[PDB]
């Protein structure tokens, strides 16, 4: 995906502020709570019977950290998301068979989490830049379906 330098600026500046130990687990937790069919892929995590259980679940936080690590890696290589996410695509597409619409969902949940965390700092242009980014990551993760 081609971000403008203004878009790249919006994304990069915000991201430096992100708590990489927490936001991933918050986004994943919310995905599992808001789109409960996603819990299908994480039955090993244990208690997901309530929102509190999910958000407080240590496995959710731990796996979310890895997920955010992948996003960070995409952010570092915006001009080659396809190469970056090759292996993860193979995993989510060929092995896990996750429907790609769910990539788009997690991306939008991440956006919600950024909005929640940054509030007014997460302006409509900053959002628009992040939408380009999560679309690009979703598309790359889905490449093994193309």
């Amino acid at each position: 995906v081609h971000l403008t330098p203004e878009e790249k600026s919006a994304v990069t500046a915000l991201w430096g502020k992100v708590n990489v130990d927490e936001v991933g687990g918050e986004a994943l937790g919310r995905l599992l709570v808001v789109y409960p069919w996603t819990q299908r892929f994480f039955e090993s995590f244990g208690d997901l019977s309530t929102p509190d259980a999910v958000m407080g679940n240590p496995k959710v936080k731990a796996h979310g950290k890895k997920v955010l690590g992948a996003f960070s890696d995409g952010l570092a290589h915006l001009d080659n998301l396809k190469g970056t996410f090759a292996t993860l695509s193979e995993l989510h597409c060929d092995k896990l068979h996750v429907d790609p619409e769910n990539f788009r969902l997690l991306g939008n949940v991440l956006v919600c989490v950024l909005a929640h965390h940054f509030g007014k700092e997460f302006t409509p242009p900053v959002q628009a830049a992040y939408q380009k980014v999560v679309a690009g990551v979703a598309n790359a993760l889905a490449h093994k379906y193309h």
Binding site: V34, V54, P125
Partner: protein
């Protein structure tokens, strides 16, 4: 099907939004137009620049519609019937676009409700907006 808990949550969130409802609606629209440029083609006659009085005015109408839905949450199809007619028959709004505006409404609430936008309330609001969207696209089914 909105649960009692969802209805409680949605009502709580709207309460916290209070009199900002219209302004948040306008902000949701701007987020949508910037983030999802395809949606702009439904408003070719609007000025969509930041600060547009037309976007502000429309944001208020949109917010008013949602609050009417909250206020008649058990009778949404009936409450939103005219709006459903308009969006499907006259405007021919692509159903995908309701997901885009719903997302931008969530983002807007999230950016304004640090305490209120918990995972539970986020879930309830998502269902609410999904339910509203289902009604507004029902003239397609």
């Amino acid at each position: 099907v909105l649960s009692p808990a969802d209805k409680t949550n949605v009502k709580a969130a709207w309460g916290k939004v209070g009199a900002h409802a219209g302004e948040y609606g306008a902000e949701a629209l701007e987020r949508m137009f910037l983030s999802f440029p395809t949606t702009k083609t439904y408003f070719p006659h609007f000025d969509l620049s930041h600060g547009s009085a037309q976007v502000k005015g429309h944001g208020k109408k949109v917010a008013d519609a949602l609050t009417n839905a909250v206020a008649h949450v058990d009778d949404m199809p009936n409450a939103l019937s005219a709006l459903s007619d308009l969006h499907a028959h006259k405007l021919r709004v692509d159903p995908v676009n309701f997901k885009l505006l719903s997302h931008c409404l969530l983002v807007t609430l999230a950016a304004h409700l640090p305490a209120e936008f918990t995972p539970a309330v986020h879930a309830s609001l998502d269902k609410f907006l999904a339910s509203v969207s289902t009604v507004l696209t029902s003239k397609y089914r």
